[PDB]
Ligand binder design. Structure first.
Ligand SMILES: O=C(O)CCC(=O)Nc1ccc(C(=O)O)c(C(=O)O)c1
Length: 438
């Protein structure tokens, strides 16, 4: 397959549903390269656990943890890492209120080259145990010979775009990794980088990040088709922000407008949002504790009950993962019969203005609060007009894209409710025999 899109291993499904999945130990294994140094970008870390996932022979190689923690949380992370003299830390600046360092990425420097891993899992045991998570694995990028002058750039501009993303941190530890990336050949990369960084972006910089970055890529590298108005938009996420008092405030006015862009020319497009119901969580492998990683608060939800009519259940029979609650985030553009897709995005970005950006200053400025990162699969980058949807995620022409959940998505039933993590559920027990009392 050309796509190199994987799911994490799930404990408790039959082996056929983990053949072709990846655990963090597989990613860090010497089979993937001889590790010299690594950078772990993430939100939450269990440092003792993390070091144990590296092969024993690699556990004292330098590790950089890139995080967004402040004050006591920052102190707690430093205390976690202090026993390991080989671990350095980089605090990503979050100068806009209510922002988060959400990006999940590994930079893996080998004797043999460099690998980039963009994924959706926190570096804690529970995120790799029984959840649905996504991974994109870059090729092994060879080093450019010293004295040779070449760009090492791909047709998707991934090298420059990744360096640009790292430059936004303004961090000395990441300038070192920028210099590493400069020295490597990333020309084989067939995905486009879509990042979010904190800031207020106008003019030439508006298209660099967030949903304007997506819009720019879809304008430049996808083509509209007849009946494009009938191709739905699907969004799938583990958290929802405050989107406003009705759909016209942000969801259907600027977010959906960017998502439905195709081609360069100048809406009743259906919008499907996939988010676990209470019943999805209750009957999941983890039970109600899976809801600890679905942090939709009642304070937010009661302000936007209009949103929940867009919500569809989590269902993933295609990958054996209906009971493995999603922490992956994906966005895609299927055909009206869900047999093809015009593009697919896997990302850290949830359904929030903080992640995707919101227009300010009379539409002239895009304000983003958080760091996010994902990769976009466009048919044009693979010599194709569209992707056929793979019928079984783990089954056997490799030019079909492995969508990890079922299509068409299924609307909530009248008795279903979105999972809301900070109210109790005491009507029916979960798969471990327990109720949920926050
Ligand atoms: O901020 C909001 O809009 C509501 C609270 C929230 O969403 N918190 C949160 C924090 C970290 C992660 C992560 O895993 O990095 C995630 C996630 O991705 O589920 C969610």
């Amino acid at each position: 397959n050309p796509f190199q899109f994987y799911l994490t291993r799930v404990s408790g499904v039959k082996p056929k549903y983990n053949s072709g999945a990846l655990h963090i130990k597989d990613i860090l294994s010497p089979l993937f390269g001889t590790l010299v140094s690594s950078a772990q970008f993430n939100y939450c870390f269990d440092v003792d656990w993390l070091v144990k996932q590296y092969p024993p022979e690699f556990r004292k190689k330098p590790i950089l943890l890139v995080h967004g923690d402040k004050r006591e949380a920052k102190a707690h992370l430093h205390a976690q890492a202090k026993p390991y003299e080989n671990i350095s830390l980089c605090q990503a600046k979050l100068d806009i209120a209510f922002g988060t360092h959400h990006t999940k990425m590994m930079l893996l420097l080998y004797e043999e080259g460099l690998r980039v891993v963009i994924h959706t899992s926190n570096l804690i045991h529970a995120d790799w145990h029984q959840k649905t998570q996504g991974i994109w694995l870059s090729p092994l990028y060879p080093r450019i010979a010293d004295g040779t002058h070449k760009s090492g750039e791909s047709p998707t501009h991934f090298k420059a775009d990744l360096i640009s993303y790292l430059m936004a941190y303004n961090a000395p530890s990441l300038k070192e990794w920028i210099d590493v990336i400069h020295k490597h050949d990333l020309s084989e990369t067939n995905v486009y980088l879509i990042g979010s960084t904190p800031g207020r972006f106008q003019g030439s910089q508006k298209d660099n990040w967030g949903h304007f970055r997506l819009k720019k890529l879809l304008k430049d590298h996808a083509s509209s088709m007849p009946n494009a108005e009938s191709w739905p938009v699907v969004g799938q996420f583990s958290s929802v922000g405050s989107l406003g008092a009705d759909e016209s405030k942000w969801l259907c006015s600027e977010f959906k407008e960017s998502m439905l862009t195709l081609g360069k020319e100048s809406s009743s497009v259906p919008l499907y949002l996939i988010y676990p119901s209470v019943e999805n969580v209750r009957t999941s492998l983890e039970g109600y504790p899976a809801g600890g990683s679905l942090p939709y608060s009642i304070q937010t939800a009661e302000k936007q009950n209009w949103l929940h009519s867009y919500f569809h259940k989590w269902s993933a029979e295609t990958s054996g993962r209906s009971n493995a609650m999603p922490h992956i985030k994906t966005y895609m553009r299927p055909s009206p019969d869900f047999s093809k897709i015009a593009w697919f995005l896997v990302t850290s970005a949830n359904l929030s203005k903080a992640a995707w950006g919101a227009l300010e200053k009379n539409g002239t400025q895009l304000m983003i609060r958080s760091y996010e990162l994902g990769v976009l699969f466009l048919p044009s980058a693979f010599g194709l007009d569209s992707f056929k949807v793979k019928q079984k995620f783990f089954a056997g022409p490799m030019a079909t894209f492995p969508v990890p959940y079922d299509l068409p998505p299924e609307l909530y039933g009248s008795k279903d409710r979105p999972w809301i993590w900070n109210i109790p559920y005491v009507k029916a027990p979960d798969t471990h025999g327990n109720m949920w009392v926050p």
